[PDB]
Amino acid sequence: GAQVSTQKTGAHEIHYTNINYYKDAASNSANRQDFTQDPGKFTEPVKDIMVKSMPALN
Amino acid sequence: GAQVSTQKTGAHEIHYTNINYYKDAASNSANRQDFTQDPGKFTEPVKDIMVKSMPALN
Amino acid sequence: RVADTIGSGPVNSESIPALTAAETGHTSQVVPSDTMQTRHVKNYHSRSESTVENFLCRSACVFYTTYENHDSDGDNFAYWVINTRQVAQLRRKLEMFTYARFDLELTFVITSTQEQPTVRGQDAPVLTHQIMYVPPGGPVPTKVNSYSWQTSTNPSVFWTEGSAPPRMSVPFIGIGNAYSMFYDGWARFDKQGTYGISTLNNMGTLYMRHVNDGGPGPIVSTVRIYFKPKHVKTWVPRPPRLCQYQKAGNVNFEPTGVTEGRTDITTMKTT
Amino acid sequence: RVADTIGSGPVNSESIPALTAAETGHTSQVVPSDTMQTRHVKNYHSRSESTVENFLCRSACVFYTTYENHDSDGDNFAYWVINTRQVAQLRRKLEMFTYARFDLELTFVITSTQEQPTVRGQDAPVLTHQIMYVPPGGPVPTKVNSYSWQTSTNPSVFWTEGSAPPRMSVPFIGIGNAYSMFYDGWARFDKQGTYGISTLNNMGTLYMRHVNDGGPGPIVSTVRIYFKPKHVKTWVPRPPRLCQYQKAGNVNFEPTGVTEGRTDITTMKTT
Amino acid sequence: SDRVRSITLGNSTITTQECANVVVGYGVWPTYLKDEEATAEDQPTQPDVATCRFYTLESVMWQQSSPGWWWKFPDALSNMGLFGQNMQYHYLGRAGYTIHVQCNASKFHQGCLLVVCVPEAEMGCATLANKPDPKSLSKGEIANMFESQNSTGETAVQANVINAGMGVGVGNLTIFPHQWINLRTNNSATIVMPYINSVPMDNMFRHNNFTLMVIPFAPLSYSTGATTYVPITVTVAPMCAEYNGLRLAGKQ
Amino acid sequence: SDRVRSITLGNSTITTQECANVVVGYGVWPTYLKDEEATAEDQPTQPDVATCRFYTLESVMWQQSSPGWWWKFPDALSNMGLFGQNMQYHYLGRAGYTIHVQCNASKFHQGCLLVVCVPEAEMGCATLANKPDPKSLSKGEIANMFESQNSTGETAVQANVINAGMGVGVGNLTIFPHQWINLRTNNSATIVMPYINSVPMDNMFRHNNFTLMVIPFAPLSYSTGATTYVPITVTVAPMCAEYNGLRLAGKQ
Ligand SMILES: CCCCCCCCCCCCC/C=C/[C@@H](O)[C@H](N)CO
Ligand SMILES: CCCCCCCCCCCCC/C=C/[C@@H](O)[C@H](N)CO
């Protein structure tokens, strides 16, 4: 059960391969490839949206 | 995801096998098999071609 | 990956992007294109290295202590009650978040040194150490040869000198749904007693010793302990620690200035 | 692979291959067949070994320094501000190109030696070293036991003696689109200040030390640093360095003759 | 036909009666910066015809003892009309150039010049422990000169021609884009240089980019009676010049 | 919404909190010269973002006795960055402008300015047998001022406001593109002026084209305590500027 992922390659111009050998998920290597991103939680917690090109205070 | 390439064999008379084990392309071995070659950049940068059998200065 | 800057040109509208009301507690989502003529740029920059995991996922010394081959009873063995607050570096990083959940990769760097009352023909066989983890409640050792070192249940590592840093992985062993880096509360319902982060701290103790018994010449060994969070999840970000740390068990601080100063609000001379 | 020499015979034409005009700044593409009777030769010679990658891709010492087990405060630890210009060999190779882009494979050879005030019963446990890389701006160590050695974020290697050269790979960490080997410009817009390649040089500093604290007898360790470019791309080739090097931070040279001389333009005696 | 030539840029035309070809950069022809290669986000100015035209620098006289001359670009053009004005008002800029070196003699005259454009020509100081000074490096539109003996100076450029001021064999300057002006056949050299640098754009005051070097490998020579005044003129045209980061003007 | 406003030209943005509309020329919006309307044959330079941006002139203070001020365009911009540099190097040029006059007061303050752009504002001399001098006509980016009594001067402009320096009823300046800044409602005026002239292009030094006039018809007034320092700032942006006839720089 080998897993083939993608290496960090760079941008203006390849895969790896991993097999887990231990019975415990804690033994696994790092999740260095998780790129989820949601600023909205902290940057726009306002209940009434807020459009940019609009008069902020009506 | 094993990659099979060709060894430097010699000419007047075979494959390898590589698996990358690291998440970063920088960890990979050398690109010792890249044989691109273009002298034209330095040997003939002249705008008007230049044929060999011809009178260089017309 | 980051955003491309989309080309924009002249404007003459009644849409006012630059003007907002920060009172709302909302950060403006303005970009260059909104206030100037922009050219198009295909941006390839990635935010790979600021991911919480890559930020915390590098081994960091959290402590070290020493013990001696021979010399008797304090000296003989050492112990440490596990906690991540005795070091500035790591502690400040974890503390950029209120709660966190993660696995750990422990690595130990163990080194030995000779002490002065030397002796002749001193030729010591290689040293093997034992580190034992004693979960809260387990019978703790009282001298280098207490019965508890038989570890029928506590986990321990036996490692010999010269052979590469022993290492293990430990799961999220917390009893809550996350490790709390802050706790504005007390341990007792009557508020008497301890207050603060220490009320939560109960992760056990590490115990180390030499295995080969004391030889002629005295030797001192130091055990450096490394923590590396893995499989990290972090909630409720907070301001980075400003004031230096004073105590390991609380947030006590000496008031300190918000920044370094400069001569006037007009000085371009970077400090 | 190289070109076959195609067989050719007698000629009596008004096509003149041998006559050109080098003024054009164009190198003639003549081959034997154009000026003599050639036989056919199937050439199997390959140019595999002159590929830029195979040329640069061999580990080369770029520096070395020393530090001591005991002795206090300069001696105790060492540091090196990374640069590839303090050695003749590598420096001249990279310098055959104006710009280059590549990854690196660092290998360290660390060796230790005993110093004379010996002591009796000297029997030292194996030594473990620590090398720490401090990116520009990071708090730098001031003595063998400064807080910065806890490396919660800077990368470091801990290596024990007798166990095979520690090694790592580092990406193209440049901030431009390539590393510049030359820079005919200044660091400041007013041209006051530094001039030349050093204006670009800001790759951080390496710091090394012993981990096991100082024992009776003094020991000195030397750290040799090896660089091996990998995944190489190189632009704008230039003439190889003629004059020997004088300084690490610039191209300063003592004028020197174009070649060795001989007695007359007629001497076949190879020097 | 084809030794003759005509080049029009802006409101300026150059004609040649006896050239070779036109050497082009490293085969690359100049072009504006692409969105995929760009990093500075502001909309660039691309004046065009007002800036990408032929500027004729000061002439220089070739004598039988001249070791050679050199000019640094963009520096040499920092005072030429609008190209220079744009350099002042902008933090960043980039451009390519068509360089046309002129030198007519007679049929009875002889000599041969190497005309090279050396990208990134960091130069050495005459005295090892110092750095040359701005003016020893570039006198603007005024050529600096190489010397036929070790230069001495406490802050001068080590200008002995044989090492081209760079510590290399002057005879190998050939891997750089060049042409020769062998009076016997030529009378001009035309070299188009694309923008070469390790960054998409750069400040035009603190970085020089490439240096034009004119070096006689066979000395001017002639019999008495023949005219002894043989000037070498240099006309250059920026190509595809764009600037970014407009603000007030100057260096600093 | 709609009294608020944002205008971006080049690397400059203007925002307004309380405007009227934006008055546009004679309904014409500025545009480059068409091949059918052109006569000068050389290819024009159309720098763009480097020249068509907002230049902010010197401010002026409105006092309860100020009769008015005036500035002449292109003159007022002859020293502003690249717009000015292009004016120098070129025989011909043409452009339109977005003029934004600023003046905030308080709610307790009162007053009302006429902001007009008078195309071709030939002015009369104070002394009938002379012609005013260049400086009485235009002090560059520095406003000239009208007076509330007959000006005397041997070479001065007859600046008594009531005839707007032109021999007409100041109250009829209204057939020219204008807006008012009645502090009670406004705080700025924005006027876009297309290029108006009897020729497709013209020299920018010897001809003025249009004059901006700011004239208070109801004087600044306020009760003691209220701030007495009420500046009037003028920010202008050339639009669709093209130049032709490049040569060396200067007037003459
Ligand atoms: C054989 C060796 C076994 C070693 C086992 C070590 C287990 C301890 C893991 C501790 C992870 C603790 C990180 C800190 C959490 C605290 O900040 C919070 N106060 C708890 O809520
Ligand atoms: C744990 C050890 C980590 C060690 C990290 C070392 C990072 C440094 C890599 C440097 C590659 C530099 C090669 C030289 C480039 C220079 O020539 C140019 N002046 C830069 O433009």
Partners of residue E147 on adjacent β-strands: E160
Token output for F41:
């044959």
Note whether D50 and B23 are within 8 A (CB).
no
Angle between helices E81-89 and F81-89 (to 10 degrees): 170
In DSSP terms, E72 is beta-bridged to E211
Q: Is D140 in the pocket of ligand 2 (CB under 6 A)?
A: no
Closest partner residue to B57 among E1, E3, E26, by Cβ? E3
Asked if residue E165 lies in contact with residue E124, where contact means CB atoms within 8 angstroms, the answer is yes
Chain breaks in chain E (C to N over 2.5 A) after: none
- Ligand 2 atom at shortest distance from the alpha carbon of D178: 21
Helix (H) or strand (E) holding D258: none
Inter-residue contact C219 to D125 (CB < 8 Å): yes
- Nearest-Å Rg of the Cα atoms of chain C is 27
CB pairs under 8 A between A and F: 3
CB contact under 8 A, D183 and E120: yes
Q: How many CA atoms lie within 13 Å of F64's alpha carbon, on the beta-carbon side?
A: 7
The angstrom resolution of this structure is 3.0
F187: tokens are 């705080």
Say how many C-beta atoms besides its own lie within 10 A of residue A17's C-beta.
Answer: 15
* CA F116, F118, F121, F124 torsion-angle sign: negative
- Cα E45 off chain centre by: 24
Residue B35 CA to ligand 2 centre (angstroms)? 27
Terminal CA-CA length for chain E:
51
Query: Rounded to whole angstroms, how far apart are CA atoms F137 and F121?
Result: 10
Q: Which residues of C touch D123 (CB under 8 A)?
A: 114, 122-124, 217
In terms of Cβ atoms closer than 10 Å to its own Cβ (0-12, 13-18, 19+), residue F199 is exposed
Partner residue facing F50 (CB), from E11, E246, E248:
E246
Which ligand number lies closest to the CA of residue C204? 1
Helix (H, G, I), strand (E, B) or coil at D104: strand
Which secondary structure element, helix H or strand E, spans residue B54, and what is its range? Answer: none
Handedness of CA C138, C144, C145, C149 (dihedral sign): positive
Query: What CATH number did the domain enclosing E236 receive?
Result: 2.60.120.20
Give E152-173 as a 3 state SS string: CCCCCECCEHHHCCCCCCHHHH
Asked if residue E171 lies in contact with residue D258, where contact means CB atoms within 8 angstroms, the answer is yes
Any idea what the Cα angle at residue B44 is, between residues B40 and B49, rounded to 5°?
Answer: 110
CA distance D26 to B40: 10
Residue F32, judged by CB atoms within 10 A of its CB (0-12, 13-18, 19+), counts as: middle
φ, ψ dihedrals at E164, nearest 5°? 45, 25
Q: Chains that contact D by 3+ CB pairs under 8 Å?
A: B, C, E
Dihedral angle sign, alpha carbons of residues D34, D40, D45, D46: positive
Distance between C11 CA and the closest CA of chain F, angstroms: 5
Cβ count within 10 A of residue C254: 7
According to DSSP, residue E30 is labeled: P
Name the residue among C73, C130, C146, C112 with its Cα closest to residue C218. C112
Residues F177/F116, Cβ–Cβ less than 8 Å:
yes
Q: Which of C23, C34, C48 to mutate to test the interface with A (most CBs of A within 10 A)?
A: C48
Q: In what order do the strands lie in the sheet with C128-134?
A: C77-81, C205-210, C128-134, C156-160
| Beta pairing partners, D12 | none
Q: Which of A32, A34, A50 sits opposite C26 (nearest CB)?
A: A50
* Helix locations, chain E, DSSP H: 81-89, 134-137
> Which CA distances in Å does D235 have to C62, D197, F4?
46, 17, 54
Structure tokens at D184: 């005919």
CA distance C60 to A26: 18
Q: Is D221 in the pocket of ligand 2 (CB under 6 A)?
A: no
Alpha carbon distance E5, E25 (integer Å): 18
The minimal CB distance from E27 to the residues B41, B57, B58 is found for: B41
Residue owning tokens 């791309």: D233
Sign of CA dihedral E203, E204, E208, E210: positive
Cβ–Cβ contacts within 10 Å for residue F252, how many?
Answer: 5
Amino acid type, D77 = F
Residue whose CB lies within 8 A of the most ligand 2 atoms, among D81, D129, D203, D232, for a mutation test: D203
Q: Return d(Cα F242, Cα D96) in angstroms, integer.
A: 47
Is C237's Cβ below 8 Å from some Cβ in A? yes
- Give Cβ neighbours of residue C232 (< 8 Å, ≥ 6 apart): A31, C52, C53, C56, C57, C100, C101, C102
Cα-to-centroid distance, C251 and ligand 1 (Å): 19
Cβ proximity of C157 and D158 under 8 Å: no
d(CA A19, CA A4): 9
C191: its two tokens: 């508020």
Domains belonging to chain A, first-starting first, are 1-58 (4.10.80.10)
Cα separation, B27 vs D167, in Å, equals: 11
- DSSP conformation letters of D109-124: EEEEEE-SS--TT--P
For residue F191, which of F109, F101, F113, F128 has the smallest C-alpha distance? F101
**Domain around D147:** 1-271
- Spatial separation of the C-alpha atoms in residues C198 and C248, rounded to whole Å: 9
D176 vs E: CB within 8 A: yes
Cα distance between residue D12 and residue C261, in whole Å: 88
Per-residue burial over C51-66, b = 16 or more CB atoms within 10 Å of its CB, e = otherwise: bbbbebbbbbbbbbee
* CA–CA distance, A40 with A56 (Å, rounded to integer): 17
Helix H or strand E segment including F29: none
Closest-CA residue to B5 (of B28, B24, B25, B22): B28
Q: D26 contacts in E (CB within 8 Å)?
A: 20-21, 23
Residues 6+ apart with CB under 8 A from A36: none
State the Cα angle at B52 between B49 and B55, rounded to 5°: 90
Task: Give the list of residues 6+ apart from residue E64 with CB closer than 8 angstroms, or none.
Answer: E219, E220, E221
Chains that touch A (3 or more CB pairs under 8 A): B, C, F
Cβ–Cβ below 8 Å for D21 and B57 = yes
Ligand at minimal distance from the CA of D177 is: 2
Closest CB to E27: pick one of B40, B50, B57. Answer: B40
Q: Which helix (H) or strand (E) holds C104?
A: strand C97-114
DSSP 8-class letter at A27: G
Our answer on whether the CB atom of C31 is closer than 6 Å to any ligand 1 atom is no
Instruction: Determine the residue of C81, C83, C170 to mutate for testing ligand 1's pocket, defined as the one with the most ligand atoms within 8 A of the Cβ atom.
Output: C170
DSSP string, C54-66: HHH-S-EEEEEEE
Q: With 0-12 CB in 10 A as exposed, 13-18 as middle and 19+ as buried, what is E136?
A: buried
In the 8-state DSSP scheme, what is residue C55? H
Distance CA D25, CA F60 (A): 64
Residue C203 CA to ligand 1 centre (angstroms):
5
**Cβ contacts of C54 on chain D, cutoff 8 Å:** none
Q: Supply the range of the domain harboring residue F167.
A: 1-252
Q: Is the peptide bond before F74 cis (omega within 30 degrees of 0)?
A: yes
Q: Which of C106, C173, C179 to mutate to test the pocket of ligand 1 (most atoms within 8 A of CB)?
A: C179
Q: Is C203 in the pocket of ligand 1 (CB under 6 A)?
A: yes
CB E205 within 8 A of CB E78: yes
Query: What Å distances lie between residue C18 and C13, D80, E86, F14, F98, CA to CA?
Result: 12, 48, 29, 10, 20
Question: Do B45 and E20 count as a contact with CB atoms less than 8 A apart?
Answer: no
Residue E249 CB contacts under 8 Å (≥ 6 apart), including other chains? E85, E88, E89, F81
Helix (H) or strand (E) holding B43: helix B40-43
CA-wise closest residue to E243 among E52, E99, E98, E71:
E52
**D171 min Cα distance to partner chain C (Å):** 13
Strand pairing category for F230-246 and F55-56: antiparallel
Tokens describing residue F58: 């010197």
Rounded to whole angstroms, what are the CA distances from F43 to E49, E241, F5, F201? Answer: 7, 17, 36, 13
Give the whole-angstrom CA distance, residue F94 versus residue F85: 14
| C-alpha to C-alpha distances, D41 to C51, D5, D36, D93, nearest whole angstrom | 60, 5, 14, 34
Output the domain CATH number for residue D12.
Answer: 2.60.120.20
Tokens of D114: 């005993």
Contact D215, C218 (CB under 8 A): no
Q: Give me the number of domains chain C comprises.
A: 1
Task: Give the residue from E216, E235, E237, E236 showing the smallest Cα distance to E105.
Answer: E216
Token digits of residue D144: 């063998």
CA E224 to chain centre: 33
Return the number of other C-beta atoms located less than 10 Å from residue A48's C-beta. 8
Q: Rounded to whole angstroms, what are the CA distances from D137 to C48, D84, D154, D155, D205?
A: 21, 20, 11, 14, 10
User: What span, in angstroms and rounded, lies between the C-alpha atoms of F125 and F133?
Assistant: 9
Q: Do C58 and D212 touch (CB under 8 A)?
A: no
Instruction: Give φ, ψ of C111 to 5 degrees.
Output: -130, 150
Burial class (CB in 10 A: 0-12, 13-18, 19+), F164: buried
The residues with which D230 forms a beta bridge, in sequence order, are D103
Q: In 3-state terms, what secondary structure has residue D160? A: strand
- CB D162 within 8 Å of CB C164: no
Tokens 């066989």 correspond to: C125
Q: Are D149 and D132 in contact (CB under 8 A)?
A: yes
Half-sphere exposure at residue F238, Cβ-oriented, CA atoms within 13 angstroms = 29
Query: Prior bond to E74 cis, omega within 30?
Result: yes
Cβ–Cβ < 8 Å for F178, F116: yes
User: Where do runs of H (alpha helix) occur along C47-87?
Assistant: 52-56
Helix H segments across D17-157?
52-56, 88-94
> How far, in Å, CA of D172 to CA of D184, rounded?
22
CA distance C69 to C76: 7
Torsion of the alpha carbons at B21, B27, B31 and B32, rounded to the nearest 10: -80
What method was applied to determine this entry?
A: X-ray
Segment (H or E) for C207: strand C205-210
Query: What residue type is D89 in one-letter code?
Result: Q
